[PDB]
Amino acid sequence: NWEHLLSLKRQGDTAKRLRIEQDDTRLGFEVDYDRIIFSAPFRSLQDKTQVITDFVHTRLTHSLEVSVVGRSLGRMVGKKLLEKYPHLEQVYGYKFNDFGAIVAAAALAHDIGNPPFGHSGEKAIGEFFKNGYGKRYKDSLTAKEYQDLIKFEGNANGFKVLSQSKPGAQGGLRLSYATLGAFMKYPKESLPHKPSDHIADKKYGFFQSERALFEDVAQELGLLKRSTTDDVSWSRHPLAYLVEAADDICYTIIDFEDGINLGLIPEEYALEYMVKLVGQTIDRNKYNALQETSDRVSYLRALAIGTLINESVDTFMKYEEEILAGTFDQSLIDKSNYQAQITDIINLSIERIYNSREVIEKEIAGYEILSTLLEARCRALDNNDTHYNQLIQQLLAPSLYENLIQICAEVSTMTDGKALRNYKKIKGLD
Amino acid sequence: NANWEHLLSLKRQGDTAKRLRIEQDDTRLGFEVDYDRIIFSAPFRSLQDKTQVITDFVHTRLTHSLEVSVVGRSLGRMVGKKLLEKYPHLEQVYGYKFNDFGAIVAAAALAHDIGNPPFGHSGEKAIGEFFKNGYGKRYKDSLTAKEYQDLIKFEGNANGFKVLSQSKPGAQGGLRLSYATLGAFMKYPKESLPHKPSDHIADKKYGFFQSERALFEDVAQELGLLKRSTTDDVSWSRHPLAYLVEAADDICYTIIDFEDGINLGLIPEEYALEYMVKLVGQTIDRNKYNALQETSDRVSYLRALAIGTLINESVDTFMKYEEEILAGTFDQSLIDKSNYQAQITDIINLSIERIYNSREVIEKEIAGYEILSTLLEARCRALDNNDTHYNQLIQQLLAPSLYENLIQICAEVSTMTDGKALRNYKKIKGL
Ligand SMILES: [Mn+2]
Numbered sequence: 001n002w003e004h005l006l007s008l009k010r011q012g013d014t015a016k017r018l019r020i021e022q023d024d025t026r027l028g029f030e031v032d033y034d035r036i037i038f039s040a041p042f043r044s045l046q047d048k049t050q051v052i053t054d055f056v057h058t059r060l061t062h063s064l065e066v067s068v069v070g071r072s073l074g075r076m077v078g079k080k081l082l083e084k085y086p087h088l089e090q091v092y093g094y095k096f097n098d099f100g101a102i103v104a105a106a107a108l109a110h111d112i113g114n115p116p117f118g119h120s121g122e123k124a125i126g127e128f129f130k131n132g133y134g135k136r137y138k139d140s141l142t143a144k145e146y147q148d149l150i151k152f153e154g155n156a157n158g159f160k161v162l163s164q165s166k167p168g169a170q171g172g173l174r175l176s177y178a179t180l181g182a183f184m185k186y187p188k189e190s191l192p193h194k195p196s197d198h199i200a201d202k203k204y205g206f207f208q209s210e211r212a213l214f215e216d217v218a219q220e221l222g223l224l225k226r227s228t229t230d231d232v233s234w235s236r237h238p239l240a241y242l243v244e245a246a247d248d249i250c251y252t253i254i255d256f257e258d259g260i261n262l263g264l265i266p267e268e269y270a271l272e273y274m275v276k277l278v279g280q281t282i283d284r285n286k287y288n289a290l291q292e293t294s295d296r297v298s299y300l301r302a303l304a305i306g307t308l309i310n311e312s313v314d315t316f317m318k319y320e321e322e323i324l325a326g327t328f329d330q331s332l333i334d335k336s337n338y339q340a341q342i343t344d345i346i347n348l349s350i351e352r353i354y355n356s357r358e359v360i361e362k363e364i365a366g367y368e369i370l371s372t373l374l375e376a377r378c379r380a381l382d383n384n385d386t387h388y389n390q391l392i393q394q395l396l397a398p399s400l401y402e403n404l405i406q407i408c409a410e411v412s413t414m415t416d417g418k419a420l421r422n423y424k425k426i427k428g429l430d
Numbered sequence: 431n432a433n434w435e436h437l438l439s440l441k442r443q444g445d446t447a448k449r450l451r452i453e454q455d456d457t458r459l460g461f462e463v464d465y466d467r468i469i470f471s472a473p474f475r476s477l478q479d480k481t482q483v484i485t486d487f488v489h490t491r492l493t494h495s496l497e498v499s500v501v502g503r504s505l506g507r508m509v510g511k512k513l514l515e516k517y518p519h520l521e522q523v524y525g526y527k528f529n530d531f532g533a534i535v536a537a538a539a540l541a542h543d544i545g546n547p548p549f550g551h552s553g554e555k556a557i558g559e560f561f562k563n564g565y566g567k568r569y570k571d572s573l574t575a576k577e578y579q580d581l582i583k584f585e586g587n588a589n590g591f592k593v594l595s596q597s598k599p600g601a602q603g604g605l606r607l608s609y610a611t612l613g614a615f616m617k618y619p620k621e622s623l624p625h626k627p628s629d630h631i632a633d634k635k636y637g638f639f640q641s642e643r644a645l646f647e648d649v650a651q652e653l654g655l656l657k658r659s660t661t662d663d664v665s666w667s668r669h670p671l672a673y674l675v676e677a678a679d680d681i682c683y684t685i686i687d688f689e690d691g692i693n694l695g696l697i698p699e700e701y702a703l704e705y706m707v708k709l710v711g712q713t714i715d716r717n718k719y720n721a722l723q724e725t726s727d728r729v730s731y732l733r734a735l736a737i738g739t740l741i742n743e744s745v746d747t748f749m750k751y752e753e754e755i756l757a758g759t760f761d762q763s764l765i766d767k768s769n770y771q772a773q774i775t776d777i778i779n780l781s782i783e784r785i786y787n788s789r790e791v792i793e794k795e796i797a798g799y800e801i802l803s804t805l806l807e808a809r810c811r812a813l814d815n816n817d818t819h820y821n822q823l824i825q826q827l828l829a830p831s832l833y834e835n836l837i838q839i840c841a842e843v844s845t846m847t848d849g850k851a852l853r854n855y856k857k858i859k860g861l
């Protein structure tokens with residue numbers, strides 16, 4: 001039921017929270033958004049770079065733009081869901097802005113747990129425990145606990161960041177269970193690894209240390225079981241599809257916009273790649289009167305995102321029943337009529353942005369930086385008596401699995417600067 | 431009308447007797463020795479640390495000068511062989527050989543950038559701006575109209591001529607290049623005034639400072655260059671070989687600026703074949719081109735071919751208008767008559783839009799104005815009050831007739847490496 005998928009429950013609650021009795025000015029889904037804005041992990045995205053270190057393409061702005069596109073998807077789908085299921089409003093008190101707030105909040109947080117240097121940074125963490133120093137702990141861990149480490153996922157670390165208990169602060173940000181369900185693109189544990197080619201099975205979404213929490217979330221939401229073994233898996237909260245579409249749309253279109261502004265993509269290619277996405281709404285005469293490259297391409301970007309938002313709303317509603325029953329197999333953007341153009345855009349970005357010498361140089365440097373910090377923390381964990389390892393603990397961080405996963409969580413959330421600075425000190429270089 | 435027997439003079443400054451070509455040792459031929467004198471000279475060596483517009487560390491003025499001198503040697507060899515067919519007595523009676531023309535063009539071309547200030551034509555303009563509106567405006571009423579014009583329109587070509595010929599104690603005549611080489615060096619045989627008397631390319635700039643006028647008068651008289659004016663404002667018709675030095679330079683900066691910009695990313699690689707297909711298609715091996723897997727290899731194949739095409743045509747243009755050049759009645763450059771002027775123009779235009787107006791280049795030239803002004807001001811203030819403790823410090827640091835002093839300060843600031851210039855500038859400024 002959509003009634004259960006829209007849970008306002010917060011972790012530790014002993015009583016049901018009913019939608020009809022909420023204060024409109026203090027609606028739990030919108031409180032969630034505010035809690036994220038003011039959280040220290042979201043603020044740290046100011047000093048985190050998406051791919052190009054130009055200092056004006058942060059992960060903060062990306063997260064903001066994804067949440068704006070999310071609220072728009074949530075509002076429009078919300079309005080149509082309330083027309084399809086009128087009891088949801090007339091009896092339970094839901095409003096279309098509710099679905100915008102849930103999608104907006106989970107999208108705002110989607111990037112929050114990811115390590116620096118993108119996918120290279122996840123792979124360096126994993127390689128540290130698969131083949132580097134962290135190999136030694138394998139025999140002291142369960143198969144799923146070790147799999148958390150060798151296949152470290154920033155999505156799962158995001159879930160940990162949002163919900164981690166600390167003294168005086170149990171339950172992290174304590175977001176609504178609907179918001180956490182809309183956050184979880186991959187509602188499975190680290191094993192079994194990729195049991196199918198379903199998008200929800202391409203990674204996993206929570207570490208073992210958050211397993212008990214997501215169990216409580218999935219039971220409250222009423223997510224459909226995808227496993228009846230001790231390897232737990234569930235079908236995605238419907239709104240998670242909208243969070244994913246917001247991110248899909250922004251990375252595809254805005255990465256391209258960035259590449260052109262940066263010079264990595266010749267501006268001559270702008271209209272060729274965008275014409276199908278914008279061709280019926282573009283005011284060509286206004287496009288030609290624009291005098292700056294950055295204005296022409298942001299005009300194209302707004303047209304394309306508009307096109308892809310309207311279509312994604314319509315794809316969600318064409319497949320809503322399948323999504324509610326956990327039988328939908330793809331992403332919304334996979335069903336797009338512009339799939340081929342989207343793929344050409346993404347491939348051009350891989351060729352001209354992600355495989356440029358500057359980006360490659362950053363990732364190679366990232367591997368050493370993270371590998372160094374992980375070894376410094378893990379040796380300090382093994383022999384915490386020596387003077388050097390007392391110092392290492394005071395500089396970076398003032399059960400074995402709980403310890404190792406916390407070290408990954410902490411190295412992962414370090415800003416680009418502090419990582420490079422602490423790495424520089426450990427290696428002596430300035 | 432000029433005579434090829436006098437235009438090929440082996441005279442060096444101060445010579446008391448004539449140098450006949452027949453009497454030369456071919457192992458120590460005057461024109462070839464000119465090339466070595468340049469290679470080994472301090473001003474040429476300093477081009478190692480003098481960057482062009484782009485500072486990739488592998489785009490130097492030494493490489494440009496080298497490649498211009500190579501293309502120049504080819505131009506002069508091929509024209510030289512055709513000139514000896516037309517005028518056989520030059521070999522039968524005077525003993526000239528076609529490699530002589532190759533050597534003259536090659537030595538003049540090699541030296542053509544030797545006197546330019548750093549930072550391009552922006553460097554020249556920073557110096558002029560200094561004397562036109564900066565601290566150096568104060569000298570206007572103590573200089574002649576033409577001494578002041580030398581300064582406010584300071585010209586790297588004219589500074590070049592000074593570098594090659596400047597007398598010093600124990601070194602009369604500078605490098606003492608052959609007069610034929612000095613004649614081919616001089617793309618603009620005129621004084622600083624009058625400014626742009628005509629639209630001829632030879633009238634666009636000027637070629638020698640007042641301090642060097644008497645010197646070029648000697649060169650022009652010996653070569654027998656044709657007097658283009660006798661109004662007390664001296665100018666001559668260009669030595670014919672000067673058109674080839676110019677053509678070699680024109681060819682290289684047109685094609686190799688394009689290549690460089692493609693390699694640096696500033697010009698999409700697609701434009702390479704698009705602007706160059708007319709210039710290469712009669713000579714390109716398509717099979718070879720489509721096998722080359724690296725962009726740098728493809729565009730340098732195209733560049734080698736485009737340059738070959740333009741050398742061959744430039745030789746033809748010279749030989750066609752040879753009699754008009756000898757009469758001083760040829761009004762254009764060799765490249766202005768090329769049948770690829772449409773293609774050359776589009777190349778030059780794209781290079782300007784994507785390279786010369788790129789943000790990196792604009793930035794380097796703006797900082798150059800500040801670096802050159804600061805050095806010129808420290809030098810001129812030290813000249814004006816040599817008595818203060820500071821100006822005596824400045825004198826020990828930067829340099830251990832009023833017009834001669836000012837032009838020498840200009841020559842010295844202009845010939846500084848980018849390293850010494852920036853380091854000395856930073857020192858003056860406390861950085
Ligand atoms: Mn994202």
Ligand SMILES: [Mn+2]
Nearest residue numbers: 494543679683
């Ligand atoms: Mn040149």
